[PDB]
RNA sequence: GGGGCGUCAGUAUUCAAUUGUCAGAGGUGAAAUUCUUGGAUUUAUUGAAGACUAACAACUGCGAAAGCAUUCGCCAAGGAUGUUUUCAUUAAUCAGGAACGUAAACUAUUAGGGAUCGGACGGCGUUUAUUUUUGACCCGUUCGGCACCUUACGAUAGGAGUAUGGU
């Protein structure tokens, strides 16, 4: 009610929403829905055209509203945007992140998690990091409370994990990699092939991070959309 | 239903009701907690959060988004990792005045090793 | 300015749900303390299931939930029930003015025997210093292994945060309890409502 | 900073004098074609420049500047609780004010210097000793403007209050505005105050003390005249006009004596109600407020059995 | 999760830059110092630096002790087990000496059992396994070791008041 400021500090307020226009967002190819939202960006003119900012921004959106399935209430993906059309905003994959609620919801006591990081490069020369997490399977019809794998057994599990993710992510392009990440084929094959060393309760890939994209090609970027 | 992303920074000293678009870049409207209460003691209070959420929901319904995805956080580096009263009271007032809520997530900065 | 009213009256589009994982020794106690939990969460409008096969508590917002902070209350409730707070206290977080906090104290002492001594010093002789802290701060303190889980009002959360850090940093909790008793005596009379109280502690 | 002409009998307004000055914001301007200009600053660079020089004064941002009508003195006020008077012709310094507790906001010269500060106080200092002659309290926020009369001080507690210097106690207070109050202008001929602030309203006040003093004077004149004509009617025995004048003068200890006399006159008219036909006539021709006031005295006379 | 050297990450904090900002922010029981229209706190994205390695994390593991928790590589060393392995007293103990280095504050067996981890062996079986390896789970035997409980087999190791007279 009473102000607090110093002498001559409140400038005359200008309306900031005259200079703002909306832009619908379309998702790339392998996701089920395409219209995902709307972004309020500044009005374009000379001295910083707004398409530079639209090339700069990224979005973070969950997978439930993309696949229309609430099985994926976790695994928030990130979408860069590099292209613009008329009242449109075409996007591309940038990363895939869990929610910290599920990261707390997976860790139990008296069982081992095994973490593995790889820096793998796809055939389209995108470098990316894959962070996989894998919790140890408590075998039914057992009595002992702690399902501890030995340390050498953990090292063998991590070696097989990095071998699987390298051999099944080095061969495909980025669109096929996202199409394999969506129903979690990688974690299923790690679960299938590590059970001769120590059975694992659940293998997920908890993070995907795209580090460098050396190409801007509208041909493949529009072949997505 | 145009989903805007509401960052609610609920600390013990002041609450920040902040509304952005889906990007995170362009702030639509923010009302801090202390600009609605004359007392710095009661700056972080459920009444302050209720007033801030009512003003933010009024501005965003004048702009016509009428749907929010709410991300709640607190001081998380060496802080408390728990939201103050501002989070509960702001979410209550925000959905009590219109504003179909979408996805709720508590995105607190959790250090892997701080000090 | 500080009191909070109960919610009088579909505010959810995406059907929210949360999960937490517990071990077997908690699976027994949760299996025979669960109907109290699902009774109060049905009074709040949130469906709460328990899975003894995988070992998972789930909450999910139903069609007829109207309080939107109820999902945060329920998420904190299943976090504390996983972290072995007793069931009436975990259900006491569902009131309006309560909040929980977890204080990680294992990072504060490099040594091990010194850490065990300082944790037992925080717990006190026959629990008397711990329940004295609970009385003076209106909190529920549970010295939980490497962590300390406290509940209560936000003021009490801040004071027990300060007391737990100062107990781990070799200041005695009896000294801190004397400090809090002096602060209570000074805040009793509002004739000394705004001075610097450092001349008394 | 700049100097504009005001051409009243035209629509022509020009900004024909401009001053570059220093690198920060010109905070305040003072004026003794005009003589010259003294400009203050957001930084510590105070300057003085002629119309068709710099100096260091304080540590923080300075606030206000004021000239004497003869142009021999000049004082500057700032946030580091010092007020500085210096020689205005040369680059010399005449001294320093010792300090106003938190930070001084406005100075004023009397045609005696006035300092309004960042605390809820206001002081009157001299040239001779450079000490405060007077100190005043009573505000609830900053004061931010002190104006000479023909003194007044605004506040930041939305109240503007006037008082006098030789007495030193508060004369009057004024409570029109909304949230804040910033500045005060004055009519130079008569005493008219123009108060404005962060709120958009500007209020113009005029002095009425001379008018209400004249009204109270003529009221006491009429009072002593009609009180003596009441005593005259009592001494003469004109009970009628005595009773009318007593009901007008509203004091009843004589009205009761007139009523006891008129109901015991020892020679009553036979048709009359109270003995006198003229008192019957005025009791018939009483107004509503006089009837109600007479009833409010009648209950008090009816209490006494005498 | 023994040590050294390199390497790889992870957040968080600080600092800086780019935008959207647009009136406070920060502390406290209240305040104040301070930062704040050249835009603080906040929102997003990058970059650098230094630190540390959450949750897993234990009535556990390793090291003689202080101590030791990110991945991978290299370098020696060490423990226990097994062997169809060797010299046959080399050994035990410590005078002298030698290497590693803000705190305190409630305190010949015991006789087995239940857990625990490190081997080695055995196996009715569930899951790897498209079937053999092999591993996970369950069980038994055997050495070895941190700790629990029971039993001992036993043991054994001046203060407070009140006065009186001096100084």
Q: What is the 3-state secondary structure (H, E, C) of chain A?
A: CCCCCCCCCCCCCCCCCCCEEEEEEECCCCCCCCEEEEEEEECCCCCCCHHHHHHHCEEEECCHHHHCCHHHCCCEEEEEECCCECCEEEEEEEEEECCHHHHHHCCCCCECEEEEEEEEECCCCCEEEEEEEEEECCCCCCCCCCECCCHHHHHHHHHHHHHHHHHCCCCCCHHHHHHHHCCCHHHHHHHHHCCCCCCEEEEEEEEEEEEECCCCCHHHHHHHC
* Burial label, C118 (beta-carbon count in 10 A; 0-12, 13-18, 19+): buried
Question: How far is it, in rounded angstroms, from Cα A59 to Cα A52?
Answer: 15
Q: How was this one solved?
A: cryo-EM
Closest C-alpha to A20, from B101, B8, B23, B102: B23
User: CB of B75 within 8 A of CB of B11?
Assistant: yes
**C-beta of residue A139 within 8 angstroms of C-beta of residue A219:** no
- CB-nearest to C55 from A64, A70, A108 is A108
According to the 3-state scheme, what is the secondary structure of chain D? CEECCCCCCCCCCCCCEECCCCCCCCCCEECCCCCEEEECCCCCEEEEEECCCEEECCCCCEEEEEECCCCCCEEEEECCCCEEECCCCCCCCCCCECCCCCCEEEEEECCCEEEEECCCEEEEECCCCCCEEEEEECCCCCCCCEECCCCEECCCCCCEEEECCCCCCEEEEECCCCCCCCEEEECCCCCEEEEECCCCCEEEEECCHHHHHHHHHHHHHHHHHHHHHHHHHHHHCCHHHHHHHHHHHCCCHHHHHHHHHHHCCCCCCCCCCCCCHHHHHHHHCCCHHHHHHHHHHHHHHHHCCC
Instruction: Return the ∠ at Cα C96 (arms to C92 and C98), rounded to 5°.
Output: 55
Instruction: Determine whether the distance from the CB of A7 to the nearest atom of strand E is below 7 Å.
Output: no
Q: CA–C1' span, A157 to E79, in Å?
A: 25
Do B85 and B42 contact (CB within 8 A), yes or no?
no
Q: Residue C166: phi, psi to the nearest 5?
A: -75, -25
Euclidean distance between CA atoms C182 and B65, whole angstroms: 52
Residue D82, burial from CB neighbour count under 10 angstroms (0-12, 13-18, 19+): buried
In chain B, helix, strand, coil percent, each to 5? 25, 30, 45
> How do strand A127-136 and strand D17-18 relate by DSSP bridges?
unpaired
D90 in Cβ contact with D105 (< 8 Å): no
What CA–CA distance (Å, rounded) separates B103 from B70?
A: 6
Is strand E within 7 Å of residue B38 (CB)?
no
Residue D81 corresponds to which tokens in the numbers above? Answer: 């609780």
Task: Decide if D82 contacts D63 (C-beta within 8 A).
Answer: no
C170 CB-to-strand E distance under 7 Å: yes
Of A186, A57, A54, A175, the C-alpha closest to A122 is A175
Determine the distance between B89 (CA) and E42 (C1') in angstroms.
19
Structure tokens at D286: 């009483």
DSSP letter at C7 equals P
* Residues C132, C171: Cα–Cα separation, whole Å: 16
Is B40 labeled as ligand-binding?
yes
CA–CA separation, B51 and D203 (whole Å): 32
Interchain CB contact of A42 with B (< 8 Å):
yes
Strand, coil or helix: C39: helix
- Backbone phi, then psi, for D78, in 5-degree steps? -145, -170
For the purposes of burial, counting CB atoms within 10 Å of the CB of C47, is it exposed (0-12), middle (13-18) or buried (19 or more)? middle
- 8-state DSSP, C192: G
Q: Interior CA angle at D133 toward D128 and D138, to 5°? A: 150
* Residue C119 CA, nucleotide E155 C1', distance (Å): 35
A window 57-76: Cβ near strand E (< 7 A):
57-58, 60
Min distance B97 CA to chain A CA atoms (Å): 23
Q: Do D198 and A7 touch (CB under 8 A)?
A: no
Q: How is residue C187 written in tokens?
A: 């805040």
Q: Which residue of C has its CA nearest to A202?
A: C54
Best B57, B96, B106, B114 residue to mutate vs chain C (most C CBs within 10 Å):
B96
CB within 7 A of strand E (chain C, 53-112):
104, 106-107, 110-112
**H or E stretch including C34?**
helix C34-44
Q: Identify the residue among A22, A36, A37, A74 best suited for mutation to test binding to B, counting B beta carbons within 10 A and taking the highest.
A: A37
Inform me whether the C-beta atom of residue A33 falls under 8 Å from chain B C-beta atoms: no
| A/C interface, count of CB pairs below 8 Å | 30
Whole-number Å distance between alpha carbons of D191 and D147 = 11
Check the annotation: does B78 bind a ligand: no
Distance of CA D53 to the CA centre of its chain: 40
Q: Indicate if CB(A212) is under 7 A from strand E.
A: no
Q: Do C154 and B103 touch (CB under 8 A)?
A: no
Interface touch C13/B102, C-beta < 8 Å: yes
Work out the minimum CA distance from A14 to partner chain B, whole angstroms: 14
The CA–CA distances, whole Å, from A18 to A14, A22, A43, A189 equal 9, 11, 8, 53
Q: Indicate yes or no: strand E within 7 A of the C-beta of C182.
A: no
What Cα–Cα distance (Å) separates residue A57 from each residue in A94, A129, A224? 11, 21, 19
Q: Long-range contact list for D124-130, CB < 8 A, 24+ apart? A: D124/D165, D125/D83, D125/D97, D127/D73, D127/D85, D127/D94, D130/D95, D130/D96, D130/D97, D130/D98
User: CA of A165 to nearest chain B CA: how many angstroms apart?
Assistant: 25
Nearest CB to B42; choose among C1, C4, C7: C1
Q: Assign residue C147 a region: left if phi > 0, alpha if psi is -120 to 50, beta otherwise?
A: beta
D50 touches chain A (CB under 8 A): no
**Dihedrals φ, ψ of A118, to 5°?**
-130, 145
Contacts of D65 (CB under 8 A, 6+ apart): D28, D29, D30, D38, D40, D74, D75, D76, D77, D107
DSSP state letter for C12? B
Q: Which helix (H) or strand (E) holds B10?
A: strand B2-10
| CB atoms inside a 10 Å sphere around CB A216 | 10
How far apart are the C-alpha atoms of D103 and B110, rounded to whole Å?
A: 44
Q: What angle do CA B4, B6, B9 make, to 5 degrees?
A: 165
B114 token code pair: 């701080």
Which structure tokens are listed for C36? 């109290």
Question: Are A42 and B26 a contacting pair at CB < 8 A?
Answer: yes
Cα dist. C89→B80, B81, C139, C186 in Å?
Answer: 21, 20, 11, 31
Q: Check: CB of residue A132 under 8 Å from CB of residue A187.
A: yes
What's the CA gap between A218 and D20, in Å, rounded? Answer: 54
Which residues of chain D come before a gap where C and the next N are over 2.5 Å apart? Answer: 32, 52, 111, 150
Q: How close D145 comes to chain A (CA, Å)? A: 12
Burial class (CB in 10 A: 0-12, 13-18, 19+), A102: middle
C79-88 b/e with 16+ CB inside 10 Å = b? bbbbbbbebe
Measured between alpha carbons, how far is A64 from C111 in angstroms, rounded to an integer? Answer: 47
Asked if A165 and A50 count as a contact pair (C-beta separation under 8 A), the reply is no
Angle at C97 between CA C121 and CA C150, to 5 degrees: 20
Supply φ then ψ for residue C110, to 5 degrees: -70, -40
Taking residue B44's Cβ as centre, other Cβ atoms within 10 Å add up to: 22
- For residues A61 and B22, the answer to whether their CB atoms sit within 8 Å is yes
* B70 close to C139: Cβ distance less than 8 angstroms: no
Rounded CA separation C70/B91 (Å): 10
Q: What is the DSSP letter of C8?
A: -
Which DSSP category does C6 fall into?
P
Rounded to whole angstroms, the Cα distance separating C113 from A144 reads: 29
Residue pair A91/A77 in contact (Cβ under 8 Å)? The answer is: no
Q: Which of residues 108-167 of C touch strand E (CB under 7 A)?
A: 110-112, 114, 117-118, 120-121, 125-126, 145-146, 155, 158, 162
Chain E footprint positions (protein CB, under 7 Å): 1, 8-14, 19-32, 36-39, 41-45, 51-58, 66-68, 70-72, 102-107, 115-119, 125-129, 133-139
H/E element, B61: helix B46-63
Please answer whether residues C93 and C73 qualify as being in contact, where contact means their C-beta atoms are separated by less than 8 angstroms. Answer: yes
As a residue count, chain B comes to 115
| Exposure letters C124-153 (e unless 16+ CB within 10 A, then b) | beeeebbebbbebbebbbbbeeebbbbbbb
User: Measured between alpha carbons, how far apart are the two ends of chain A, in Å?
Assistant: 52
Q: How many CB pairs under 8 A join A and B?
A: 42
- Measured CA to CA in angstroms, residue D118 lies from A107, A118, C79, C155, D30 at distances of 58, 62, 52, 34, 21
Chains that touch B (3 or more CB pairs under 8 A): A, C
Nearest chain B residue to A18 by CA: give it: B63
Residues 6+ apart with CB under 8 A from D285: none
Contacts of A10 in chain D (CB under 8 A): 198
**Half-sphere exposure (Cβ direction) of A43: Cα atoms closer than 13 Å:** 6
Is the CB of residue D204 less than 8 Å from the CB of residue D193?
yes
Selecting from A17, A59, A62 the residue whose C-beta is nearest the C-beta of B23 gives A59
By the 10 Å C-beta count (0-12 exposed, 13-18 middle, 19+ buried), A163 is classed as middle
CA dist D93 to B54, D36, D42, D85, Å?
58, 19, 21, 7
Task: Please list, residue by residue across D153-180, b when 16 or more beta carbons sit within 10 angstroms of its beta carbon and e when fewer do.
Answer: bbbbbbbbbbbeeeeeeeeeebeebeeb
Distance CA D183, CA D181 (A): 6
Instruction: Enter the tokens of residue C91.
Output: 């259900």
CA distance B91 to chain A (A): 19
Contact C3 B91 (CB under 8 A): no
Distance CA C44, CA C170 (A): 43
**Enclosing H/E stretch for C173:** helix C173-188
- Residue C3: is it exposed, middle or buried by C-beta count within 10 angstroms (0-12/13-18/19+)? exposed
Alpha-helical regions (H) of C83-172: 87-92, 113-123, 128-137, 154-168
In the numeric block, the tokens 């639209």 are attached to A54
List residues bridging with C47 in a β-sheet: C60
Residue C6 to residue C95: CA distance in whole angstroms: 9
User: Which of D95, D193, D121 is CA-nearest to residue D151?
Assistant: D193
Helix D209-236 to helix D253-263 angle (10° resolution) is 30
Integer Cα distance of C19 and B99 in angstroms = 26
Q: What are phi and psi of C70, to 5 degrees?
A: -65, -30
Gap from B71 CA to E127 C1', Å: 43
The distance (Å) linking the CA of A155 with the C1' of E5 is: 22
Contact call for residues B35 and B15 (beta carbons, < 8 A): no
Q: How far apart, in whole angstroms, are the C-alpha atoms of residue A166 and residue A163?
A: 5
Q: Phi then psi for D48, rounded to 5 degrees?
A: -145, 130
Spell out which residues of chain D touch residue A7, defining contact as CB-CB under 8 Å. 27, 63, 144
């Amino acid at each position: 009610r009473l102000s607090k400021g110093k002498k001559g500090l409140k400038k005359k307020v200008q309306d900031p929403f005259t200079r703002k226009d909306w832009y619908n967002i379309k998702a790339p190819a392998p996701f089920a829905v395409r219209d995902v939202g709307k972004t309020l960006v500044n009005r374009t003119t000379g001295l910083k055209n707004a398409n530079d900012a639209l090339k700069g921004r990224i979005f973070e959106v969950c997978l439930a509203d993309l696949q229309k399935d609430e099985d994926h209430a976790f695994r928030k993906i990130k979408l860069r945007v590099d292209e613009v059309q008329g009242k449109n905003c075409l996007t591309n994959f940038h990363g895939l992140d869990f929610t910290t609620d599920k990261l707390r919801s997976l860790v139990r006591k008296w069982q081992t998690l095994i973490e593995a990081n790889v820096t793998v490069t796809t055939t389209d020369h995108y470098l990316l990091r894959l962070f996989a997490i894998a919790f140890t399977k408590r075998r039914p019809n057992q009595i002992k409370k702690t399902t501890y794998a030995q340390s050498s057994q953990i090292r063998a599990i991590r070696r097989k994990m990095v071998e699987i993710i390298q051999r099944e992510a080095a061969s495909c392009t980025l669109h096929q990699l996202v199409s394999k990440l969506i129903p979690e084929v990688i974690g299923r094959e790690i679960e299938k092939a590590t059970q001769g060393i120590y059975p694992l309760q659940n293998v997920h890939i908890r993070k995907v991070k795209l580090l460098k994209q050396p190409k801007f090609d509208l041909g493949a970027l529009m072949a997505l959309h | 239903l145009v989903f805007g992303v509401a960052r609610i920074f609920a600390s013990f000293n002041d609450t920040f009701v902040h509304v952005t678009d889906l990007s995170g870049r362009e702030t639509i409207c923010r009302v801090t907690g202390g600009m609605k209460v004359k007392a710095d003691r009661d700056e972080s209070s459920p009444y302050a959060a209720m007033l801030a959420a009512q003003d933010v929901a009024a501005r965003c319904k004048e702009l016509g988004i009428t749907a929010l995805h709410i991300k709640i956080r607190a001081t998380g580096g060496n802080g408390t990792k728990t939201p103050g009263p501002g989070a509960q009271s702001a979410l209550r007032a925000l959905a009590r005045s219109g504003m179909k809520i979408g996805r709720i997530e508590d995105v607190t900065p959790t250090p892997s090793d701080s000090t | 300015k500080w009191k909070i009213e109960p919610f009088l009256p579909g505010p959810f589009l995406e059907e929210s749900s949360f999960m937490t994982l517990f071990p077997k020794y908690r699976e027994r106690y949760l299996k025979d303390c669960w109907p109290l939990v699902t009774k109060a969460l049905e009074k709040h409008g949130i469906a709460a299931t328990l899975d003894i096969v995988e070992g998972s508590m789930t909450v999910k917002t139903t069609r007829k939930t109207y309080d939107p902070a109820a999902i945060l209350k329920a998420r904190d409730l299943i976090k504390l029930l996983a972290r072995s707070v007793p069931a009436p206290q975990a259900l006491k977080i569902l009131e309006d003015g309560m909040a929980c906090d977890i204080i990680k104290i294992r990072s504060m002492v490099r040594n091990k025997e010194r850490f065990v001594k300082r944790r037992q010093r925080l717990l006190g002789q026959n629990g008397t210093t711990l329940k004295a802290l609970e009385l003076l701060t209106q909190t529920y303190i549970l010295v939980h292994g490497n962590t300390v889980s406290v509940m209560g009002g936000y003021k009490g959360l801040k004071e027990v945060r300060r007391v737990v850090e100062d107990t781990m940093n070799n200041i005695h909790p009896i000294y801190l309890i004397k400090e809090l008793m002096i602060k209570r005596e000074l805040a009793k009379d509002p004739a000394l409502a705004h001075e610097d109280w450092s001349r008394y502690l | 900073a700049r100097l504009w002409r005001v051409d009243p009998a035209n629509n022509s307004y020009t900004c024909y004098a401009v001053f570059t000055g220093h690198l920060e914001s010109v905070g305040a301007v003072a004026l003794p074609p005009p003589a010259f200009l003294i400009s203050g600053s957001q930084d510590r660079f105070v300057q003085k420049r002629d119309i068709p020089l710099r100096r260091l004064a304080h540590d923080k941002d300075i606030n206000a500047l004021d000239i004497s009508p003869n142009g021999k003195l000049f004082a500057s006020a700032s946030q580091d609780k010092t007020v500085k008077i210096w020689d205005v012709e040369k680059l010399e310094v005449q001294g320093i004010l010792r300090g106003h507790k938190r930070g001084v906001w406005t100075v004023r010269f009397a045609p005696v210097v006035l300092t309004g500060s960042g605390d809820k106080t206001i002081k009157l200092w001299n040239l001779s000793d450079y000490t405060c002659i007077r100190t005043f309290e009573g505000h609830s926020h900053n004061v931010l403007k002190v104006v000479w009369l023909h003194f007044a001080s605004a506040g930041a507690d939305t109240l503007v209050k006037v008082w006098d210097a030789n007495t030193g106690e508060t004369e009057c207070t004024l409570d029109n505005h909304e949230d804040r109050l910033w500045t005060l202008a004055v009519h130079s001929k008569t005493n008219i105050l123009a108060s404005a602030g962060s709120d958009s309203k500007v209020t113009f006040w005029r002095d009425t003390t001379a008018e209400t003093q004249a009204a109270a004077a003529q009221a006491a004149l009429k009072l002593v005249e009609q009180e003596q004509t009441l005593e005259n009617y009592i001494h003469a025995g004109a009970y009628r006009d005595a009773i009318v004048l007593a009901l007008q003068l509203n004091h009843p200890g004589r009205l009761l004596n007139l009523f006891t006399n008129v109901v015991t006159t020892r020679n009553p008219d036979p048709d009359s109600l109270t003995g006198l036909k003229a008192v019957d006539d005025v009791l018939a021709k009483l107004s509503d407020e006089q009837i109600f006031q007479l009833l409010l005295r009648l209950r008090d006379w009816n209490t006494n059995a005498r």
